[PDB]
Amino acid sequence: DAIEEKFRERLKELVVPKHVMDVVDEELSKLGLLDNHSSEFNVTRNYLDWLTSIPWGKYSNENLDLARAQAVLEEDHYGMEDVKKRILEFIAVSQLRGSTQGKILCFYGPPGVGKTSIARSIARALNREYFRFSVGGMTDVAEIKGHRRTYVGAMPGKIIQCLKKTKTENPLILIDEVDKIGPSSALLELLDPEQNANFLDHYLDVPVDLSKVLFICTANVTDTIPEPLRDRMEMINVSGYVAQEKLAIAERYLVPQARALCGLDESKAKLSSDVLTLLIKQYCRESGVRNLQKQVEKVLRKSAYKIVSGEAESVEVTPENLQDFVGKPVFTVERMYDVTPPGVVMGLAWTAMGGSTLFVETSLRRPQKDGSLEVTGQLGEVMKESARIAYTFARAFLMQHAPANDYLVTSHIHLHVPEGATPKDGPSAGCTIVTALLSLAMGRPVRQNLAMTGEVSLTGKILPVGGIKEKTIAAKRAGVTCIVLPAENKKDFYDLAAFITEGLEVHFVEHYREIFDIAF
Amino acid sequence: RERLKELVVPKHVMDVVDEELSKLGLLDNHSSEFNVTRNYLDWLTSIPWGKYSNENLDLARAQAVLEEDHYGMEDVKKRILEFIAVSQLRGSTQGKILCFYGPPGVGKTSIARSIARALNREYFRFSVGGMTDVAEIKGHRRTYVGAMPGKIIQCLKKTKTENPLILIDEVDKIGPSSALLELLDPEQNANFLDHYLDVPVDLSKVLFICTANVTDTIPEPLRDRMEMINVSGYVAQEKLAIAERYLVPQARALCGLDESKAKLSSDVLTLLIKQYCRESGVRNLQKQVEKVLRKSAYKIVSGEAESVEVTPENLQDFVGKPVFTVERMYDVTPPGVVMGLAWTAMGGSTLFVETSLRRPQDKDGSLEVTGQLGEVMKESARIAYTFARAFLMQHAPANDYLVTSHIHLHVPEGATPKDGPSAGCTIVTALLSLAMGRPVRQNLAMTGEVSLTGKILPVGGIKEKTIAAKRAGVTCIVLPAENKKDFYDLAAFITEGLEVHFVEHYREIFDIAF
Amino acid sequence: RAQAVLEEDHYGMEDVKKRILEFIAVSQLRGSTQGKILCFYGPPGVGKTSIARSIARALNREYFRFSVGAEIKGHRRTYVGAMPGKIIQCLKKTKTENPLILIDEVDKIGPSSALLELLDPEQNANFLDHYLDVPVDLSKVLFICTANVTDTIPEPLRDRMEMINVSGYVAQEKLAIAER
Numbered sequence A: 001d002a003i004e005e006k007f008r009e010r011l012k013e014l015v016v017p018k019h020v021m022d023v024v025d026e027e028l029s030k031l032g033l034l035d036n037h038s039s040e041f042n043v044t045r046n047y048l049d050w051l052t053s054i055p056w057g058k059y060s061n062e063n064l065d066l067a068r069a070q071a072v073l074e075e076d077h078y079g080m081e082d083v084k085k086r087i088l089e090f091i092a093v094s095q096l097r098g099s100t101q102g103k104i105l106c107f108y109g110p111p112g113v114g115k116t117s118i119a120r121s122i123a124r125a126l127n128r129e130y131f132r133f134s135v136g137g138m139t140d141v142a143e144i145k146g147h148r149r150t151y152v153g154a155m156p157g158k159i160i161q162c163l164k165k166t167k168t169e170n171p172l173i174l175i176d177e178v179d180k181i182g183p184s185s186a187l188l189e190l191l192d193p194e195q196n197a198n199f200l201d202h203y204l205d206v207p208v209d210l211s212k213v214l215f216i217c218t219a220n221v222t223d224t225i226p227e228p229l230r231d232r233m234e235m236i237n238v239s240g241y242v243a244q245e246k247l248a249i250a251e252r253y254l255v256p257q258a259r260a261l262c263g264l265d266e267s268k269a270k271l272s273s274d275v276l277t278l279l280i281k282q283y284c285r286e287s288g289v290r291n292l293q294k295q296v297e298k299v300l301r302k303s304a305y306k307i308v309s310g311e312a313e314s315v316e317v318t319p320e321n322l323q324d325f326v327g328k329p330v331f332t333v334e335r336m337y338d339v340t341p342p343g344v345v346m347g348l349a350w351t352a353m354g355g356s357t358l359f360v361e362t363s364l365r366r367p368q369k370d371g372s373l374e375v376t377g378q379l380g381e382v383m384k385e386s387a388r389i390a391y392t393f394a395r396a397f398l399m400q401h402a403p404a405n406d407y408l409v410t411s412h413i414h415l416h417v418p419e420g421a422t423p424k425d426g427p428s429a430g431c432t433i434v435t436a437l438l439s440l441a442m443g444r445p446v447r448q449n450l451a452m453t454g455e456v457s458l459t460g461k462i463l464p465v466g467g468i469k470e471k472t473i474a475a476k477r478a479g480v481t482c483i484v485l486p487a488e489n490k491k492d493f494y495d496l497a498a499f500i501t502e503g504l505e506v507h508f509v510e511h512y513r514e515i516f517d518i519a520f
Numbered sequence B: 001r002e003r004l005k006e007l008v009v010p011k012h013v014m015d016v017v018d019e020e021l022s023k024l025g026l027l028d029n030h031s032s033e034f035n036v037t038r039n040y041l042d043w044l045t046s047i048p049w050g051k052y053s054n055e056n057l058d059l060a061r062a063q064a065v066l067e068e069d070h071y072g073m074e075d076v077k078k079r080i081l082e083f084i085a086v087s088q089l090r091g092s093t094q095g096k097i098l099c100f101y102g103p104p105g106v107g108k109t110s111i112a113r114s115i116a117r118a119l120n121r122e123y124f125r126f127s128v129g130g131m132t133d134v135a136e137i138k139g140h141r142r143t144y145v146g147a148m149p150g151k152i153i154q155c156l157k158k159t160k161t162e163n164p165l166i167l168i169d170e171v172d173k174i175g176p177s178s179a180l181l182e183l184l185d186p187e188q189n190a191n192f193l194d195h196y197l198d199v200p201v202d203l204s205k206v207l208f209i210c211t212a213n214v215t216d217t218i219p220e221p222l223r224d225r226m227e228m229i230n231v232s233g234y235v236a237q238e239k240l241a242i243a244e245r246y247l248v249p250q251a252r253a254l255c256g257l258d259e260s261k262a263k264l265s266s267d268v269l270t271l272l273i274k275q276y277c278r279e280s281g282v283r284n285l286q287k288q289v290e291k292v293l294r295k296s297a298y299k300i301v302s303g304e305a306e307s308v309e310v311t312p313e314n315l316q317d318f319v320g321k322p323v324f325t326v327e328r329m330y331d332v333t334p335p336g337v338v339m340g341l342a343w344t345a346m347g348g349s350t351l352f353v354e355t356s357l358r359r360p361q362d363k364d365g366s367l368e369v370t371g372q373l374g375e376v377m378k379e380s381a382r383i384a385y386t387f388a389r390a391f392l393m394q395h396a397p398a399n400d401y402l403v404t405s406h407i408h409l410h411v412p413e414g415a416t417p418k419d420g421p422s423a424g425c426t427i428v429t430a431l432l433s434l435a436m437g438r439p440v441r442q443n444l445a446m447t448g449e450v451s452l453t454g455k456i457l458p459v460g461g462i463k464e465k466t467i468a469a470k471r472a473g474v475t476c477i478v479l480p481a482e483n484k485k486d487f488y489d490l491a492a493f494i495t496e497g498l499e500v501h502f503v504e505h506y507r508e509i510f511d512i513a514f
Numbered sequence C: 001r002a003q004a005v006l007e008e009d010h011y012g013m014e015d016v017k018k019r020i021l022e023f024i025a026v027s028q029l030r031g032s033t034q035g036k037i038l039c040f041y042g043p044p045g046v047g048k049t050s051i052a053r054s055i056a057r058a059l060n061r062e063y064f065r066f067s068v069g070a071e072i073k074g075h076r077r078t079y080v081g082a083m084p085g086k087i088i089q090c091l092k093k094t095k096t097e098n099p100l101i102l103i104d105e106v107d108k109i110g111p112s113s114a115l116l117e118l119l120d121p122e123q124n125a126n127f128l129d130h131y132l133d134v135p136v137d138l139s140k141v142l143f144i145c146t147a148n149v150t151d152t153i154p155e156p157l158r159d160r161m162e163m164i165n166v167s168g169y170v171a172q173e174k175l176a177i178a179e180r
């Protein structure tokens, strides 16, 4: 009949596996006896529509060439050397084996660093089809595994929809916000090399081969990703950008794209490098370039309005007239303390938004039985415990360094981290709290440009802390000249690029007794 | 086929139309399948493909339309004019995602209608604050009985254009965020799939006007990919101008009257603004005006009078006794109480901080904190208490009040939940004024986060706080120095009589207030 | 005479009677009743369902009621039990094109889109039904709706409603109602 011939013509060019062919044959035989007006006829027709639309034997012709792919990758993005190295290794492995292959990757980092744009660029370089869907906040398993034919509203799920859309068995599938998933049990089957080749969808009732599909996941923090799901995929860190990198991105990518978006041209609107530097250092505060893009778009919108209105035939943006386009600076103040009085020590922080600088303030609550420490600043339970440990160690250290100084054992002290409205957690501020307490007790301020991080033990040992790269970037942004780090983080600090640490006087410590000598 | 004559149909919809028509050509009319196929094909043929509304791109006519339709709203008007300029440079229609956030009743919904009129686009509005499901914006599949293609397909159908203006109302109260990401994002808005019909429609040209009351409760991804445009409140004179030019004429026209039958004097509107209403918007003012004009219409029709002039002498005959009989809680502040400013989803408001002795004397002193304060606000109060004690140790070492006396601190809005560190400096001022037995300047307001060493940190909502302060008749205001950008974004007539002080450390505030 | 019949039909609710009297006044001055539709809301048993029948007597219009819970658009014309929407038989039995329509307890609606068709002046005169292939002009009909609560009503419906509250009764008013 016409329907059977249509479905078979849909099926001519595919190299269908034997079991799928048997299923299609039996469903066609079933359709050959049902009446056209039957609802079961509708169900069978809808089923055969999906089975005859899966690209059982079609593969996209990849560009297995290192030079062209490297050119595309380095022309589409700046500074993503880890991701580019991984993709070049993928291409080399595909070329050496002489066949297409699939892998499961995961890009994690602060928002606005380019995790999705790099995935689109990778799909462009590999000549693979591109598809993406978001699992953030997802609570329904049935949108991946599908619903069986019995129910009226059954759908074969996102993976089968992607396979039908892309018409290839080796596309690039981006799963966005895997760390914000509510449902993960379907993903465990979806991306697992032992069972990718036999992924069974409830609607299809027939397995599809997903071994050649290149899965790329996106997240911001790895710890929130489910534990059995974090083990299947490979973690690649897409870290934030330093001011120089952001300036390079703005000059090379952001401004040229926003000019085309606004319809302007280079001769019509010119963005000086000083303007971009000012926008970076005073109109944005982030690890990515997400807000810088919006500021550039605002500047070019104002320029376009000026051109159309006839106020000027061409407009040049200058740090003298930048306020005409974006107003007054948003971040005029970079550091809370230019010079720190006794009792406050500057530290470093790391969050899902990247690295940041924090201060630890201490003061007396009562003039001149026991003493006590009050802690405020929306600090978490871990950081409250860190403050208790730091207070105990400060008492112990001051007992032996200055026996006559009964300040810590008798005085009542309040400790605050001035970012009162922002929740804070982590034990990395223990050494900073110890230093703040000791500086308050001795009445001596610490080195005026020193920053520090590191967990402290009850006996004073300094323990490694995470987020060294983001903390170093924040220190460089804040004008820190000397940074104190745990010795176990030496392997993490020297992995940094030279332009991130060219001006830092770095000290690596094992115990607080030498942090005391460094800071005092 | 006759319905598709002029449409520029996508290449992937004629196959669906042809198969639906071929199926229809063989089914019997009385079958339910025939009826559902008729409905589906009617939906596919009524939905316009490829046609666009003739958006007028005259920066002069649209500027005039926007200025005549609404008072103020300079930022929104500038945004729309520059959008028109960008569209002119591009040479083709375009769409963007805009968000109007501000106190309720300030015109965020009506300014979108004015924008739609100015752009010659079609307009639609739907609310998402009461939405907790996902199927409403995408409908139900044709197999379900009584299925409909959601709301969006209905809009694009009845507007008969591919680039309408869609207002997304009450976004800040999502109960479905990811469903809004897949629509309010230019990376995927170019292909949006409905569930009744699986055809992905192109909505990149659609101008989405988001509407919300406060940004901080909007989910992080949604607020990040849409532009924040602030629609601030109005001072009394702006309210009077809006009422005289827009509210009164509209309420008169909808009631069927004219200027000869009912007249509203400036004094009556001033009384309604100052007493019968207390808000940043004009919604309650509009309701009062409609009530007055409706009672005037009743008087006219009943034959009580041929014409009525509303005057402050007979205003109670229309709106009854005045509500909000007092403009401010304290006219002259006792020593222990200091004026403050607050910002909420309903707009700015003025709060007070009351302190008094809890024990008869004048071991150490203590601070009790009541007034439905939040945890962050309790921490701010503790920091303020510690800093006030430290400051009094150095300003007046003989003053043992703060270090020995037991103090109770209350915020007289005892039933309303309040939170935020912006009242730290107010709390410090209240504690010091109670300790010294001195009242602050009688017409002084202040706000700002305080640190343990006394530094003043920037706070949000400076615009609404200043509007509320001007409403409360304050003459001197203290703000953090980092909020100078936000303060001067206000119109010059708002900050006319306000003596403005920008501070970085509490010593300046102490020198100003005392 | 509208005021007289409102007084004779219901005791108390002097503020409510004043509000409806204002409604007739403004409708008469406008020359037509088309506009915002009245929405009486309040506790159960407070006279909301009857207040509208009293209004219908006051305006000398015919009265009708149907409670929501599509019945608005009926069924397609076939041999299989064809029966169109509720509004048409209202015209059948009221024998006029301008009866008063009471929409009872809008909160319990399951057909919101079909209901909104009647409330839009730009299409209320072009009402279409499944059984009737001909449009019907509902320009002259008058709508009043009632609800126990206003928050849970459909959002596209709420903005079209002009909320009128019924404040309940006091012991003396309840005694008068019981006696009379």
Ligand SMILES: Nc1ncnc2c1ncn2[C@@H]1O[C@H](COP(=O)(O)OP(=O)(O)O)[C@@H](O)[C@H]1O
Pocket: A076, A077, A078, A079, A080, A110, A111, A112, A113, A114, A115, A116, A117, A118, A249, A253, A289, A290, A293
């Ligand atoms: N290193 C880079 N080189 C070029 N463009 C970049 C770079 N980093 C970010 N961008 C730009 O910033 C934008 C980031 O958006 P997106 O990648 O969707 O956010 P996220 O990184 O949070 O997923 C992209 O449009 C991209 O063009």
Ligand SMILES: Nc1ncnc2c1ncn2[C@@H]1O[C@H](COP(=O)(O)OP(=O)(O)O)[C@@H](O)[C@H]1O
Pocket: B069, B070, B071, B072, B073, B103, B104, B105, B106, B107, B108, B109, B110, B111, B242, B246, B247, B281, B282, B283, B286
């Ligand atoms: N600046 C203004 N100029 C003219 N009319 C205004 C202005 N602000 C508010 N209005 C009027 O107030 C009425 C209600 O405003 P609304 O759109 O509900 O505000 P919101 O969208 O913030 O709730 C509108 O009909 C509008 O005409």
Ligand SMILES: Nc1ncnc2c1ncn2[C@@H]1O[C@H](COP(=O)(O)OP(=O)(O)O)[C@@H](O)[C@H]1O
Pocket: C009, C010, C011, C012, C013, C043, C044, C045, C046, C047, C048, C049, C050, C051, C177
């Ligand atoms: N003010 C009143 N005067 C006379 N009868 C009343 C009054 N209020 C309520 N009733 C009586 O209460 C009965 C039921 O009220 P009903 O209208 O069903 O309440 P609801 O407003 O909840 O629908 C009616 O039959 C009516 O006669």
Ligand SMILES: [Mg+2]
Pocket: A115, A116, A117, A218
């Ligand atoms: Mg992304």
Ligand SMILES: [Mg+2]
Pocket: B105, B107, B108, B109, B110
């Ligand atoms: Mg509104």
Ligand SMILES: [Mg+2]
Pocket: C044, C045, C048, C049
């Ligand atoms: Mg009832």
